[PDB]
Design a protein around this nucleic acid. Structure first.
Lengths: 110, 55, 55, 55, 110
DNA sequence: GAATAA
DNA sequence: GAATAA
DNA sequence: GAATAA
DNA sequence: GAATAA
């Protein structure tokens, strides 16, 4: 919804494609965003395995290849991303409270 | 959908830029884990991934 | 290997069974009415005057 | 005849995008004159034919 | 057998489909339940792995993708669900004592 | 594109 | 008319 | 014109 | 019946 395609969440994320873009936005009177294709690649799915005896816990991360990242779509519900800073929008640290792709009641997520 | 706006073109001129365009619902997108109750709350998953976004 | 037996069972594809808010109900408001048109009167809407249908 | 397009299965106050309010008269006026314009004239995007002047 | 299709076990489970239903039960003289399709989806199968030295136990939950949820049918035996409250009927907390899909003797469950 | 659209 | 209808 | 457009 | 005759 926002534009992170420039990769704002860190200024460290600039490639000449962004630079090429800036020089074009200078010599251009107008633009169209023709297509935007996003591809996620999952190299690992890693849970933290918590082994708990009473009053103690042993922590280890372990690969789960039987699990997977859920890419949720909210197609039933009106929702918003809060945005503050170019960093505030990041595929990682960006969240909304009391939000779960799984509701005990009506799971509104495709 | 139907755009009606005024672009300045400096002080002496204006442009009543005015178009129609097709409506795009953009849902919300999220990357989340399975919710699995453990003995204590949820299991905690952390995904190594590479997003690839080209425009 | 991840395998199990079942009936009317399938590898799990995308399922969100709520519609994306597209649904249409159709009623016809039906309002037959026997009425009178009285021009024989002097009172208000009863006169020589054309009586109106405000569609 | 009316197609009542019923609500989403999930709240979308933002769904009014494709909803319009009726052509209801708004005002304090106790009496309101609802307009009736008889006809929409047809005009042409066509150029002429059988015009004597040669051009 | 009961009707949990409204999702009574929590009042938190109402969607407009239930609401649509109520408004129809008001304007309707009668109804038929035409078809009822249930689909379970298993995202995880997770046992609690119990590591026990004498006089101590280490607990951890671990994914078993070699195991699976048994959906039992009692097709050989006359049985009943006890029902008390709309909550008492829940796919989770609802149980009958001394009931097992596996009997050491005659396994009556398809 | 009997209610005038060459 | 894997859940026994000769 | 799995996300209900009879 | 480039000078307008539908």
């Amino acid at each position: 919804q926002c534009i992170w395609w420039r990769g704002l969440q860190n200024a460290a994320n600039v490639n000449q494609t962004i630079n090429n873009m800036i020089a074009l936005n200078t010599i251009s009177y107008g633009v169209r965003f023709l297509k935007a294709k996003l591809c996620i690649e999952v190299y690992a799915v890693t849970r933290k395995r918590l082994i708990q005896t009473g009053a103690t816990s042993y922590y280890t991360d372990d690969f789960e290849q039987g699990q997977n990242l859920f890419i949720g779509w909210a197609d039933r519900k009106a929702e918003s991303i809060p945005i503050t800073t170019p960093a505030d929008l990041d595929e990682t640290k960006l969240t909304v409270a009391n939000t779960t792709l799984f509701d005990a009641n009506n799971d509104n997520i495709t | 959908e139907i755009v009606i706006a005024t672009k300045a073109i400096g002080a002496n001129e204006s442009a009543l830029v005015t178009t129609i365009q097709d409506r795009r619902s953009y849902p919300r997108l999220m990357l989340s884990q399975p919710q699995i109750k453990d003995e204590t709350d949820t299991m905690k998953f952390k995904y190594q991934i590479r997003i690839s976004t080209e425009l | 290997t991840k395998e199990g037996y079942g009936k009317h069972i399938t590898s799990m594809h995308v399922r969100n069974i709520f519609n994306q808010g597209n649904q249409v109900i159709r009623n016809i408001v039906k309002q037959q009415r026997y009425e009178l048109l009285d021009f024989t009167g002097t009172e208000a809407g009863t006169t020589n005057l054309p009586k109106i249908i405000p569609y | 005849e009316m197609e009542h397009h019923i609500k989403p299965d999930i709240a979308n106050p933002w769904l009014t995008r494709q909803t319009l309010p009726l052509p209801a008269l708004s005002g304090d006026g106790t009496t309101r004159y609802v307009p009736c314009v008889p006809y929409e004239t047809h005009v042409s995007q066509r150029n002429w034919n059988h015009v004597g002047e040669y051009l």
